[PDB]
RNA sequence: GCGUACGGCCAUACUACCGGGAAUACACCUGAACCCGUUCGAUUUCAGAAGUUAAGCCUGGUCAGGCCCAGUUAGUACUGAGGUGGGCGACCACUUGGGAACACUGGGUGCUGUACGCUU
RNA sequence: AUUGCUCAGGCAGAACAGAAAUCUCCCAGGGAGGAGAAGGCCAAAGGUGCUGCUGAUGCUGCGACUCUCAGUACGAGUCCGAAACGUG
RNA sequence: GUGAAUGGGUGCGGACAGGCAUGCUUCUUUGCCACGACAGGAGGCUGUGUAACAGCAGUUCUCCCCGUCUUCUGAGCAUGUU
RNA sequence: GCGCGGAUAGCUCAGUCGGUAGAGCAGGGGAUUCAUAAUCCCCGUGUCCUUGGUUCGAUUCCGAGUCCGCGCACCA
């Protein structure tokens, strides 16, 4: 695109939401990071500080440093045949708690509440399988289903 | 004369001749970058650890501290309790 | 020839709203996000604010840790509970707003347990005290928020703020707002701080306004006479109602500090 | 009784139109000349220093620069806004025309000479036209002129060009023109 | 949805309960306590099940 | 059933118009000796409590504008994979999956946390 | 940096004065401004007045990084530690 | 103002998971004394086995409550236990 | 198609790197002359092709289209 700017080809890529402008809120800096957390690098325009590259903005990493407005971030990227481990340093302001792993602690706690205490039964989450045969009494007629009429007029309403 | 210079034809298949993977994923990373505030902290914490025998009499002093208390009312519980099964026999 | 309608469907259709404490004139949000955003280092260690606050007929003062569900309040303390302590009239005064900053500083200290350690400055000087740590607990530490209040050289919030300060919470402060400051000079004038911190001005002007003008004196501080009140007394009454502060800071029916 | 509570509702007492404020404006296009005289003069019918109004754009048809000063003026409020508004409606005789009135209920008037304002001297600084903008209010207005909890001033609260044309009439005794 | 209003509400949602989470948290831990116990109290009797039987 | 202080989410909360508001309040409100600030005690600061719910605030109404929700548009548009399918093409149909949007219809018009009170 | 204020434009009004001088009120999500190309961003404000300042090289042979990328440099930029300062 | 299809990042556990107790720190916190002092009551309780919960075992037992003494900040790194 | 220059009162030219404009001739009035020309005293005459940021203002700043002229267009 013959200019490789550090903000290039980001007009739909940096633009707010409708009627999401404005600075971020409270919830925002009343976050909380621990070394290790997943988070989500999502860049907010309205904070032109600390601001991550646009090449990681839907990548989930986990915290390696804590500053005092800031947090480190190991994100992988690959680069052509490997990957490699991006250090980016962004603000609190570019990132959120990441959910990717909140199924898996829902599901562990659930699993170790059932076996501490000897209520629940474990989850282990299978895929969705066939059923078995019923006999399905089912008092309802069925409807006559089939091809209708062909009307150039109630194809090509006007 | 006049080239085609630019393609990114067979740079997938070069890319996944090898499976693409992360050179140290186990590895432990390096603490430089890490806040100074932490390193320190760290080698501080670190200098002033205990002994693993010292924290074993330690913990021993602590879990003795509550024992009177708790072997008294502990026999006192046992000595109720076979009163408690004779009287679960009459249900 | 009409006007072209500005509000218009997509005008409403595409107007983004402020946010709602904003439209009521009561949050400022840069003043929030700035003195509320802790250090990241500091996982989940809040600021303690002083937000301090004025109307008409009373000033609140509140020790506040911002949460997301919401604010949480610590020892709260209204100019309106000064009369179970003995201040009876002249409340949101200088006076009064010095008087509800210490309640504030006393049944904090209480709620955490440094009450009786950290104490302060007992009989109110002008001048300055920060409050010195001991070998334990460290003074309680709490960061002033003024909000949509403008500050001026002599203002009550900074009369709430002195409560506070002298009761014995650590509040950091210079005394650039303070009755007795000179800009100019850069220094401050603790007696004229101290006249003001225990009504010297509304005594003097009620002296002032018997000696001459006998009509203005019962137009305006009608409830001073109303009451058993007279300019003379007014000074310690304010400084037996700190005493009585002191002595009993989480106080709320008259049978505790009256009647002994 | 409908009607009867509505009615005492609009003659609540603090429902009195009062002077919010007088504006004695003085725009002379020059700057310094006549413009040091105008504020001399627009601060002897006030009691206060006056505040300099500059061109906002260069305008090469009525000779003004940009940030050239070229007005002056003064807002009094009180009661020597009162007194200066009864001597501008002296001047001109009480009467008034209805298109002095806003569609807010605040009026205006200009004079020629400011000599019959009561002002001595005359050549010293010359004669000055002059506006006289007299904006009304409620007590209750200051709603939307604080910052803190400031809302904005309810539609019955609000002053219109008919109760301003007839409390000017009631006030001051005097005329309206069609 | 997957709108950016719905994901932020998401988001805000997450934030709240992780703060219910840490603010009920002590209680969490002595109730999480009282459960090893329970759950040392059962491998015991598991283990002097096995040693009568054999 | 509510008030105030601080909020979170930031219109089901906004905008306009018409009404009602018990208590605590909040608010308008009264003055300028001081602290302080102004061209103007208007804002602001200080000091008060004579009056008023008139406005602010709260609350009720509106097939109001907006916003939100459900239906519906619609298995329509679009589309991954497939064919030695059709067609001169333009493009279309079929097989196997995924599947909207505007519009229209109708309904709704903040929830709530901490503290201090009112209502008792 | 504190702090106060709110912009484009418009209705209405005021001697000369008019389409356009200055003043007043209401409306106005930004249709202004932020040096410049375009884009993004921003309203008790990353706008602007006043004022105070110099943080316009965070002491070093001083760090981790990001864009570029060969994961090289220059450059540009983010994030820190702590001396000394500005403003509050 | 909406927004697919196709896509991209991350996560999906040990038999290293998860829980529990304790230590250290010049870092953080108001949050130290304290690796301290004191301490009552109620109880067919707890576990394996069961929809018949019968039966069987007793381990510093269960609850008020991980109590009170103004009441005990986190984080990082370790020591043990399961 | 390429590169460049130019459009300013009736004619010809200045002013073209932002605070409204000139020179000569011309045209209109008066005078000298018997009368015209020369000569003397005066006067008016230009939205600076047309279109946009316009720094507060543009002939004078950039940006397109018109109108006029110039040069280049080779080995083919």
Same mark, same amino acid.
């Given at each position: 695109?013959?200019?490789?700017g550090?903000?290039?080809? /980001?007009?739909?890529?940096?633009?707010?939401?409708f009627?999401?402008?404005?600075?971020?809120?409270?919830? /925002?800096?009343?976050?909380?990071?621990?070394?290790?957390?997943?988070?989500?690098?999502?860049?907010?325009?309205?904070?032109?500080?600390g601001?991550?590259?646009?090449?990681?903005?839907?990548?989930?990493? /986990?915290?390696?440093?804590?500053?005092?407005?800031?947090?480190?971030?190991?994100?992988?990227?690959?680069?052509?045949?490997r &990957?490699?481990?991006?250090? &980016?340093?962004?603000?609190?302001?570019?990132?959120?708690?990441?959910?990717?792993?909140?199924?898996?602690k829902?599901?562990?706690?659930?699993?170790?509440?059932?076996?501490?205490?000897?209520?629940?039964?474990?989850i282990?989450?299978?895929?969705?399988?066939?059923?078995?045969?019923?006999?399905?009494?089912?008092?309802?007629?069925? &409807?006559?289903l089939?091809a209708?009429?062909f009307?150039?007029?109630?194809?090509?309403?006007? | 004369?006049?080239?085609?210079?630019?393609?990114?034809?067979?740079?997938?298949?070069?890319?996944?001749?090898?499976?693409?993977?992360?050179?140290?994923?186990?590895?432990?990373?390096?603490?430089?970058?890490?806040?100074?505030?932490?390193?320190?902290?760290?080698?501080?914490?670190?200098?002033?650890?205990?002994?693993?025998?010292?924290?074993?009499?330690?913990?021993?002093?602590?879990?003795?501290?509550?024992?009177?208390?708790?072997?008294?009312?502990?026999?006192?519980?046992?000595?109720?309790?076979?009163?408690?099964?004779?009287?679960?026999?009459?249900? | 020839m009409?006007?072209?309608?500005?509000?218009?469907?997509?005008?409403?259709? @595409? !107007?983004?709203?402020?946010? @709602?404490?904003?439209?009521?004139?009561?949050?400022?949000?840069?003043?929030?996000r700035?003195?509320?955003?802790?250090?990241?280092?500091?996982?989940? *260690?809040?600021?303690?604010?002083?937000?301090?606050?004025?109307?008409?007929?009373?000033? *609140?003062?509140?020790?506040?840790?911002?949460?997301?569900?919401g604010?949480?309040?610590?020892? +709260?303390?209204?100019?309106?509970?000064?009369?179970?302590?003995?201040?009876?009239?002249?409340?949101?005064?200088?006076?009064?707003?010095?008087? *509800?900053?210490?309640?504030?500083?006393?049944?904090?200290?209480?709620?955490?347990?440094?009450?009786?350690?950290?104490?302060?400055?007992?009989? +109110?000087?002008?001048?300055?005290?920060?409050?010195?740590?001991?070998e334990?607990?460290?003074?309680?530490?709490?960061?002033?928020?003024?909000?949509?209040?403008?500050?001026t050289?002599?203002?009550?919030?900074?009369?709430?703020?002195?409560?506070?300060?002298?009761?014995?919470?650590?509040?950091?402060?210079?005394?650039?707002?303070?009755?007795?400051?000179?800009?100019?000079?850069?220094?401050?004038?603790?007696?004229?701080?101290?006249?003001?911190?225990?009504?010297?001005?509304?005594?003097?002007?009620?002296?002032? !306004?018997?000696?001459?003008?006998?009509?203005?004196?019962?137009?305006?501080?009608?409830?001073?006479?109303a009451?058993?009140?007279?300019?003379?007394?007014?000074?310690?009454?304010?400084?037996?109602?700190?005493?009585?502060?002191?002595?009993?800071?989480?106080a709320?029916?008259?049978?505790? *500090?009256?009647?002994? | 009784?409908?009607?009867?509570k509505?009615?005492?509702?609009?003659?609540?007492?603090?429902?009195?139109?009062?002077?919010?404020?007088?504006?004695?404006?003085?725009?002379?296009?020059?700057?310094?000349?006549?413009?040091?005289?105008?504020?001399?003069?627009?601060?002897?019918?006030?009691?206060?220093?006056?505040?300099?109004?500059?061109?906002?754009?260069?305008?090469?048809?009525?000779?003004?620069?940009?940030? =050239?000063?070229?007005?002056?003026?003064?807002?009094?409020?009180?009661?020597?806004? =009162?007194?200066?508004? =009864?001597?501008?409606?002296?001047?001109?005789?009480?009467?008034?025309?209805?298109?002095?009135?806003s569609?807010?209920?605040?009026?205006?008037?200009?004079?020629?000479?400011?000599?019959?304002?009561?002002?001595?001297?005359?050549?010293?600084?010359?004669?000055?036209?002059?506006?006289?903008?007299?904006?009304?209010?409620?007590?209750?207005?200051?709603?939307?002129?604080?910052?803190?909890?400031?809302?904005?001033?309810?539609?019955?609260?609000?002053?219109?060009?008919?109760?301003?044309?007839?409390?000017?009439? =009631?006030?001051?005794?005097?005329?309206?023109?069609? | 949805?997957?709108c950016?209003?719905?994901?932020?509400?998401?988001?805000?949602?997450?934030?709240?309960?992780?703060?219910?989470?840490?603010?009920?948290?002590?209680?969490?831990?002595?109730?999480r306590?009282?459960?090893?116990?329970?759950?040392?109290?059962?491998?015991?009797?598991?283990?002097?099940?096995?040693?009568?039987?054999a």
């Amino acid at each position: 695109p013959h200019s490789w700017g550090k903000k290039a080809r /980001t007009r739909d890529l940096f633009s707010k939401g409708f009627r999401c402008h404005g600075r971020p809120s409270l919830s /925002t800096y009343l976050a909380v990071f621990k070394i290790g957390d997943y988070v989500d690098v999502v860049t907010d325009p309205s904070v032109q500080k600390g601001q991550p590259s646009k090449v990681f903005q839907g990548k989930t990493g /986990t915290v390696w440093n804590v500053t005092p407005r800031a947090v480190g971030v190991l994100v992988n990227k690959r680069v052509r045949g490997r &990957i490699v481990r991006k250090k &980016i340093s962004v603000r609190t302001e570019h990132v959120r708690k990441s959910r990717c792993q909140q199924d898996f602690k829902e599901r562990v706690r659930h699993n170790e509440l059932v076996k501490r205490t000897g209520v629940g039964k474990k989850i282990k989450r299978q895929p969705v399988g066939p059923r078995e045969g019923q006999l399905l009494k089912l008092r309802k007629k069925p &409807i006559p289903l089939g091809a209708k009429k062909f009307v150039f007029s109630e194809v090509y309403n006007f | 004369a006049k080239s085609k210079n630019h393609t990114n034809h067979n740079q997938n298949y070069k890319d996944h001749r090898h499976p693409i993977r992360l050179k140290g994923r186990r590895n432990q990373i390096s603490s430089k970058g890490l806040e100074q505030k932490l390193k320190k902290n760290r080698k501080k914490s670190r200098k002033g650890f205990l002994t693993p025998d010292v924290q074993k009499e330690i913990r021993e002093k602590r879990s003795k501290k509550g024992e009177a208390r708790r072997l008294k009312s502990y026999e006192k519980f046992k000595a109720k309790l076979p009163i408690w099964k004779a009287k679960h026999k009459a249900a | 020839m009409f006007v072209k309608i500005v509000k218009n469907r997509s005008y409403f259709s @595409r !107007l983004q709203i402020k946010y @709602r404490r904003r439209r009521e004139g009561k949050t400022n949000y840069r003043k929030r996000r700035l003195l509320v955003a802790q250090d990241k280092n500091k996982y989940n *260690t809040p600021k303690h604010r002083l937000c301090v606050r004025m109307s008409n007929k009373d000033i *609140t003062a509140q020790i506040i840790i911002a949460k997301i569900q919401g604010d949480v309040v610590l020892a +709260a303390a209204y100019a309106h509970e000064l009369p179970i302590h003995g201040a009876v009239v002249g409340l949101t005064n200088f006076a009064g707003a010095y008087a *509800t900053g210490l309640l504030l500083a006393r049944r904090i200290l209480t709620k955490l347990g440094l009450a009786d350690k950290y104490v302060g400055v007992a009989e +109110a000087n002008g001048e300055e005290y920060h409050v010195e740590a001991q070998e334990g607990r460290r003074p309680f530490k709490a960061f002033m928020d003024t909000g949509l209040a403008r500050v001026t050289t002599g203002a009550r919030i900074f009369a709430v703020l002195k409560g506070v300060v002298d009761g014995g919470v650590n509040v950091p402060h210079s005394m650039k707002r303070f009755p007795g400051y000179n800009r100019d000079k850069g220094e401050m004038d603790s007696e004229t701080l101290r006249e003001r911190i225990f009504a010297g001005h509304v005594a003097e002007y009620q002296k002032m !306004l018997i000696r001459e003008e006998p009509e203005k004196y019962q137009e305006v501080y009608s409830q001073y006479i109303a009451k058993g009140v007279k300019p003379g007394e007014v000074e310690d009454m304010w400084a037996n109602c700190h005493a009585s502060i002191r002595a009993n800071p989480m106080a709320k029916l008259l049978s505790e *500090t009256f009647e002994v | 009784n409908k009607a009867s509570k509505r009615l005492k509702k609009l003659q609540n007492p603090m429902r009195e139109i009062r002077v919010a404020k007088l504006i004695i404006n003085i725009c002379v296009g020059e700057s310094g000349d006549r413009l040091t005289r105008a504020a001399k003069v627009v601060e002897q019918l006030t009691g206060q220093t006056p505040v300099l109004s500059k061109a906002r754009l260069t305008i090469r048809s009525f000779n003004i620069r940009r940030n =050239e000063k070229i007005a002056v003026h003064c807002t009094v409020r009180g009661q020597k806004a =009162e007194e200066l508004l =009864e001597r501008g409606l002296k001047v001109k005789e009480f009467e008034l025309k209805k298109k002095n009135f806003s569609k807010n209920g605040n009026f205006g008037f200009g004079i020629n000479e400011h000599i019959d304002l009561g002002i001595k001297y005359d050549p010293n600084t010359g004669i000055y036209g002059m506006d006289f903008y007299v904006v009304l209010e409620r007590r209750g207005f200051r709603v939307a002129r604080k910052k803190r909890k400031s809302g904005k001033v309810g539609k019955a609260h609000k002053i219109t060009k008919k109760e301003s044309i007839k409390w000017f009439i =009631e006030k001051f005794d005097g005329i309206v023109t069609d | 949805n997957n709108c950016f209003r719905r994901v932020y509400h998401s988001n805000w949602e997450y934030l709240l309960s992780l703060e219910k989470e840490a603010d009920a948290e002590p209680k969490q831990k002595a109730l999480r306590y009282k459960q090893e116990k329970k759950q040392q109290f059962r491998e015991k009797g598991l283990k002097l099940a096995a040693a009568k039987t054999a």
